[PDB]
Design a protein around this ligand. Structure first.
Ligand SMILES: [Zn+2]
Lengths: 129, 205, 156, 121, 50, 82
RNA sequence: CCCGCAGAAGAAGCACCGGCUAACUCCGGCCAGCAGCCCGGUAAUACGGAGGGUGCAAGCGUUAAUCGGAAUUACUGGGCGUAAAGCGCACGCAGGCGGUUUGUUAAGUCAGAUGUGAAAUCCCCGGGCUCAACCUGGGAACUGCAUCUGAUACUGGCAAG
């Protein structure tokens, strides 16, 4: 059975980047979608597009630079068997900051550095690099 | 608590001139500075990684005349302090009263300086300081007291110093026989041959 | 200009009809005190020739690196077959912290101020290979700015 | 290895036994030598190794190697022992120069380690 | 002579990239001037222009 | 009761007193309610060897407290220092 | 604590030098001997002695014991095809986990504040003993607990899908 779709999304992205697929697609969700927002906002993806009424289908379009993939690495941090909450002062850096770490906060989803600026911690969803 | 033996032997062992003798007479004339001490001097096989580090450590220790526990303590202090660990250590070493005196030129050798310090010749801010390990601070004037000012050795030392170029981080007066420790020295001011990093590594085993 | 460090030598043997025929292996490495680095692993009946062979091999098949002023550009891992490696850029003055062959590779690489430990096997050869790997994988902030279509300030 | 399993039954610390229990955590202990004698080593050595069975203060009976060239030891000979095993069934070392044990004769190096006085000359 | 007509600090080292008295016998630190030498550290023809 | 007294907190031959409010029955350097100042007998010149938080004193006495003689002596000195 | 007197005067050992591991030569027969792990049978840098040397230093060594290294119980931080390691196979309570959308709550969770969190100890900045040790002002911290006010992304619960 499916226990974590955020995980499934990250894996699918990983494999599409691995396989030189232009895009990748999967069932759509709100959190999934705000994550896609984020990633675009940080320019690891070219664009996402959700489609469907009933069981809508999210479609990420992947990004390749000088051939190689652009999401060097992507790895979940919290998870249903083990969640990972942090205080603002406790926010990690991804790749010494050359990367990002997606985080949910009470003010929606967003990367680590935006969170720092805002001044509030939350749930570290995943590192991207 | 002090090394009382042959000084040039140590130098020989190290490889370099450690400045353990005044410098009236050149070190090559006094001893086989290239050849290592003992029966098996001429033989010189390449040392190990540990060994080189150890040697380096010894050199520095030898130069200043600091035994091992004290050295370790100094290292620890340096580590604790903010900034480049090795350079901090170096600074600390410099800061020693005897070393400062030597730099100024009131002692021919560091040993001489140390002796002077011991024998209540030197004052730091007009107060007789007897400890060779006393860490002299910025803007701390350090002078020969009026009793020890008549000594022929002191003037000789001064003369010797003069032949040698002066350190930028001090300011000394030959007539007044009082020098001001203006600031703690920068790494650039000290000798380049000392690999502080090796020393640091040795203690970071 | 280029300096060079013979890290390790080891005697090795071939069993034959007659007996044990010994040769020797030489693991050297070189760097120009800048990003470039390269290692040579030569073999010969006699040591001098083996090391000369490794010096040849290292001189070529070098590899460039992005080195922040005297140190790395970020914490990295790098692995070869039993020697996994974690290095972390370290403050000026700290010196090169590392055990052995790794110390040498860094030393020739020109880096000065690091924190480096080695997980797993310490076989000189594999671990130096892991070092060169973790140094090659490493990217500089400008280079991320490039990959991602951005200004460096955008990344800070 | 599971978190829950460790919860259920936690990790167990390997208790190593002391290899000198007769000392019972005493740096030394006194004894009387029920019998002195020598014994032969397991392959690949060849010696007539001097040794003595000692009934201890505490009531343990054990056997003690004897360091040095020549001892004075007898039965009903009050001795001290320190520990240290010789490479069978022997784990303990006689402190030369202690309570009946002489110091080795005519030794000049490691005079401490066999209880021998500085020479005077 | 230190420091006479034919000085060390005022002009340069007689030998190329060498402290005439004693330090720097390779090609790494060209320039350092220790207390024991009161000497610059450059080429053999550097004294001809100074 | 609760008395304002001294506590020898220093080094051999070099006492350095902390004045404290503490219940009487407690040991000298033992359980103290609170610390209202200090006394440095061996104070050098150009340093304040003595310092007292007078209101906190003044509160406690009104709470109905007893004052060591020395502590009294020290208060006077300050009022006269003043 | 200071002042006066005399004169180098009254003041250096331990351990080791096969490798690990800094330190090498000569002289004496698998014995005597060494040894932490991996020498000795006639040329022993590994036994004993001398020489020389290395490292510590009013101490130096052994023994004892704890943590380390040991990621060698692996939370951080391990593994199980052949090296130890998948139940012989199933059902299945307890138990752990839980697709998706809306609504709510605020329990976990984050934010802010109050209370506490002895003193001492650690450390940061200072002061005082001729320095240090030591004493010592002020901070910081004491990761925590309780109580208030909030946030609602998630997890949770309640209601509908
Ligand atoms: Zn020079």
């Amino acid at each position: 059975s499916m226990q974590d779709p955020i995980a499934d999304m990250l894996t699918r992205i990983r494999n599409g980047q691995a396989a030189n697929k232009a895009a990748v697609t999967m069932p759509s969700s709100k959190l999934k979608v705000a994550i896609a927002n984020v990633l675009k906002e940080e320019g690891f993806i070219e664009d996402f597009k959700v489609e469907g009424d009933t069981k809508p289908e999210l479609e990420l379009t992947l990004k390749y630079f000088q051939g190689k993939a652009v999401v060097e690495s992507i790895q979940r941090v919290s998870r249903p068997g083990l969640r990972i909450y942090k205080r603002k002062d406790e926010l990690p850096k991804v790749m010494a900051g050359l990367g990002i770490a997606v985080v949910s906060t009470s003010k929606g989803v967003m990367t680590d550095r935006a969170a720092r600026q805002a001044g509030l911690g939350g749930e570290i969803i995943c590192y991207v690099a | 608590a002090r090394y009382l033996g042959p000084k040039l032997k140590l130098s020989r062992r190290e490889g370099t001139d450690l400045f353990l003798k005044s410098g009236v007479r050149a070190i090559d004339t006094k001893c086989k500075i290239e050849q290592a001490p003992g029966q098996h001097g001429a033989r010189k096989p390449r040392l190990s990684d540990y060994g080189v580090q150890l040697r380096e450590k010894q050199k520095v220790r030898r130069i200043y005349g600091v035994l091992e526990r004290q050295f370790r303590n100094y290292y620890k202090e340096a580590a604790r302090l903010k900034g480049n660990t090795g350079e901090n250590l170096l600074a600390l070493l410099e800061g020693r009263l005897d070393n400062v005196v030597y730099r100024m030129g009131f002692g021919a050798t560091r040993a001489e300086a140390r002796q002077l310090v011991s024998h209540k010749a030197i004052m730091v801010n007009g107060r007789v300081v007897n400890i060779a390990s006393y860490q002299v601070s910025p803007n701390d004037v350090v002078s020969i007291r009026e009793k020890a000012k008549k000594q022929s050795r002191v003037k000789a030392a001064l003369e010797l110093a003069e032949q040698r170029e002066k350190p930028t981080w001090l300011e000394v007066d030959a007539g007044k026989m009082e020098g001001t420790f203006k600031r703690k020295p920068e790494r650039s001011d000290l000798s380049a041959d000392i690999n502080e990093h090796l020393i640091v590594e040795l203690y970071s085993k | 200009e280029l300096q060079e460090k013979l890290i390790a030598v080891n005697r090795v043997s071939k069993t034959v009809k007659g007996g044990r025929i010994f040769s020797f292996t030489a693991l050297t490495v070189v760097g120009d005190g800048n990003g470039r680095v390269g290692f040579g692993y030569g073999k010969a009946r006699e040591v001098p020739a083996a090391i000369q062979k490794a010096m040849e091999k290292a001189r070529r098949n070098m590899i460039n690196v992005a080195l922040n002023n005297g140190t790395l550009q970020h914490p990295v891992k790098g692995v070869h077959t039993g020697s996994r490696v974690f290095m972390q850029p370290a403050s000026e003055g700290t010196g090169i912290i590392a055990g052995g062959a790794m110390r040498a590779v860094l030393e020739v690489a020109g880096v000065h101020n690091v924190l480096a430990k080695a997980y797993g096997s310490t076989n000189p050869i594999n671990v130096v290979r892991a070092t060169i790997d973790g140094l090659e994988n490493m990217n500089s902030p400008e280079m991320v700015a490039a990959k991602r279509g951005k200004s460096v300030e955008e990344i800070l | 290895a599971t978190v829950n399993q460790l919860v259920r039954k936690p990790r167990a610390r390997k208790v190593a036994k002391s290899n000198v229990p007769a000392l019972e955590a005493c740096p030394q202990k006194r004894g009387v030598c029920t019998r002195v004698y020598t014994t032969t080593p397991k392959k690949p050595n060849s010696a007539l190794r001097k040794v003595c069975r000692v009934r201890l203060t505490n009531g343990f009976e054990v056997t003690s190697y004897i360091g040095g060239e020549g001892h004075n030891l007898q039965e009903h000979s009050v001795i001290l022992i320190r520990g240290g095993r010789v490479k069978p069934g022997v784990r303990y070392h006689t402190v030369r120069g202690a309570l009946d044990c002489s110091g080795v004769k005519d030794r000049k190096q490691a005079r401490s380690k066999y209880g021998v006085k500085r020479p005077k000359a | 002579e230190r420091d006479g007509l034919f000085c060390a600090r005022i002009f340069g080292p007689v030998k190329d990239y060498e402290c005439l008295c004693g330090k720097y016998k390779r090609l790494k630190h060209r320039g350092v001037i220790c207390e024991k030498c009161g000497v610059e550290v450059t080429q053999t023809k550097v004294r001809r222009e100074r | 009761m609760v008395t304002i007294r001294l506590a020898r907190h220093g080094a051999k031959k070099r006492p350095f007193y902390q004045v404290v409010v503490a219940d009487s029955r407690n040991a000298r350097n033992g359980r103290f309610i609170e610390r209202v100042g200090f006394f440095n007998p061996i104070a050098s010149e150009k340093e304040e060897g003595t310092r007292l938080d007078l209101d906190r004193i003044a509160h406690w006495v009104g709470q109905g407290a007893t004052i060591s003689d020395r502590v009294a002596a020290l208060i006077k000195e300050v009022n006269k220092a003043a």
